[PDB]
Structure 1
Amino acid sequence: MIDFGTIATAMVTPFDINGNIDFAKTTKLVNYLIDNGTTAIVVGGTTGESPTLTSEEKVALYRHVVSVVDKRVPVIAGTGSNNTHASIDLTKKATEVGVDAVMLVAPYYNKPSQEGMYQHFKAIAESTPLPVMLYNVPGRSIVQISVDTVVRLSEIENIVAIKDAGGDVLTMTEIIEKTADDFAVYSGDDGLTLPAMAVGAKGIVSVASHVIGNEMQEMIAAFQAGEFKKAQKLHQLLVRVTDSLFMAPSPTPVKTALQMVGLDVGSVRLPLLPLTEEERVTLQSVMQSIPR
């Protein structure tokens, strides 16, 4: 059974001066993340600007990240879209470049039913030998993957985990309860890392871990240790930093924050825009205020 650990990072996709994938910067980022508390990498997900990457770009990115990582942590590719046939095709291509797992989001835009999603996820999982992590995100796809649908899917051999960004730890609770011990529930919301783990989440699929991954591992350890005050103080930092990263559409703030701390990863592709000057000043003040 594959182990993504406590912090899977939803990695940004660095771009060069012309807006193309910057593989040199990607190498720097991957090595930084692994040395700063990242236990698995999600490549080409939402935070990696999957919507504006071509299929060819996605596969080149998956391949480069796999190569650099060199089996140090699991690499999860965001191959799932709202098109089942296309999702199968991309999943096959990611498998061919040696990723360890795939992330499959609830189809966005077309608003599928519970059974539609079941057949969607079932069809993609059957097409690959790789482990599958589901991704519930009604904040982006509108639909929810119901507890019962998640449970049914968990009975499929290679569907091993879920990123639950539904913002609701009570639905998380029920998923945790009604699925087997070898099915893992991750938070998809940085701010909920602590309370999600309190109810049985294995960890977090993170955006904030780009800049405070060490602090996050420290919080998780402290909680697991029973050091509630220590964990709570770091939780307060995590909430504050997370919030500053979502005042403009992600991933634009986290890319700018990385640049502020000496890891330039370029800008973003339309329809996303760079930060305004006012937005930048606000973010920098937050970044400067992180205890060092």
Structure 2
Amino acid sequence: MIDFGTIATAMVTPFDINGNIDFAKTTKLVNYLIDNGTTAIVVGGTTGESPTLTSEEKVALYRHVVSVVDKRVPVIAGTGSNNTHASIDLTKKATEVGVDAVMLVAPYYNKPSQEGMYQHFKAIAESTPLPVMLYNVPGRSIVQISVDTVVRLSEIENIVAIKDAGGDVLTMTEIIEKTADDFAVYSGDDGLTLPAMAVGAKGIVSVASHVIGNEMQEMIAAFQAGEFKKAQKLHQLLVRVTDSLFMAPSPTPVKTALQMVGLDVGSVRLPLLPLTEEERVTLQSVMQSIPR
């Protein structure tokens, strides 16, 4: 059974001055994340700006990350969209370039039923030997993958995990209870890392780990040890930092926070925009508040 560990990081896609994928900065960010508590890398997720990458950018980004990671941590490619056939296609291409797993988002915009989503995820899972991580995100796709739906899908052999960004640790709980023990439930919301884990989540698919990966690993280890007060103080920092990373449409704030800590990964592609001066000042304060 593939193990993504306790912190999968949904990596940003570094862009150069022309907005193209900056491959050399990508290498640098990949090694930095692996050195700072990242235990698996989700490439070309929401946070990697999957909406504005082309299919061929995605494939090349996947290829390059696989090569740089060199099997040090699992590489999960965000291949699902709201088009089942295009999702199968991009999943085949990801597999061909050696990724370890695919992450498949709930179809956004076209609002499929539970049965539609069942068939969509079933057909994408069936097209690859790779492990599949479902990605529940009603705050962007509107629909939710219902508990019953996730459970039906978990019975498929290569559907092994869910990244639940639904904000609800009680639906998480119910998924944990109703699926086999080898079905890994991850939080998809940084601030819920600690409470999700309290109820049995395996960990977090993270954005905040770009800047506080080590603190998050410390938090998690403290909690598992029963060191509640130490875990709570770090949870407080996690929640505060997470809030500042979503003051504006993600991933611009985290791309900006990274620039502020010495790791320039470029800007973002339209329709996302650079932070304003005032947004930047607000963010820099929060960044400057992190214990060094």
TM-score, scaled to structure 2? 1.00
Partners of 1:285 and 1:171 in 2: how far apart?
35
SS in 2 for 1:42: strand
Partners of 1:268 and 1:196 in 2: how far apart?
30
- 1:81 aligns with 81
SS in 1 for 2:259: helix
SS in 2 for 1:163: strand
Structure 1 residue 156: Cα displacement: 0.2
Partners of 1:166 and 1:268 in 2: how far apart?
25
% of aligned pairs identical? 100
Structure 1 residue 44: Cα displacement: 0.4
TM-superposition CA deviations, 1:117-153 (whole Å, max 9, x none): 0000000000000000000000000000000000000
Structure 1 residue 289: Cα displacement: 1.2
Partners of 1:284 and 1:164 in 2: how far apart?
29
Partners of 1:256 and 1:200 in 2: how far apart?
33
Structure 1 residue 244: Cα displacement: 0.2
Structure 1 residue 81: Cα displacement: 0.2
- 1:7 aligns with 7
Partners of 1:140 and 1:256 in 2: how far apart?
22
Structure 1 residue 158: Cα displacement: 0.0
Partners of 2:90 and 2:19 in 1: how far apart?
23
SS in 1 for 2:239: helix
Partners of 2:22 and 2:74 in 1: how far apart?
21
SS in 2 for 1:186: strand
Structure 1 residue 78: Cα displacement: 0.3
TM-superposition CA deviations, 1:92-134 (whole Å, max 9, x none): 0000000000000000000000000000000000000000000
- 1:232 aligns with 232
- 1:100 aligns with 100
TM-superposition CA deviations, 1:250-278 (whole Å, max 9, x none): 00000000000000000000000000000
Q: Which runs of 5+ in 1 are unaligned?
A: none
TM-score, scaled to structure 1? 1.00
Number of residue equivalences: 292
Partners of 1:289 and 1:224 in 2: how far apart?
26
TM-superposition CA deviations, 1:3-59 (whole Å, max 9, x none): 000000000000001000000000000000000000000000000000000000000
Q: Which runs of 5+ in 2 are unaligned?
A: none
SS in 2 for 1:144: coil
TM-superposition CA deviations, 1:158-208 (whole Å, max 9, x none): 000000000000000000000001100000000000000000000000000
SS in 2 for 1:47: helix
Partners of 1:276 and 1:174 in 2: how far apart?
41
TM-superposition CA deviations, 1:46-101 (whole Å, max 9, x none): 00000000000000000000000000000000000000000000000000000000
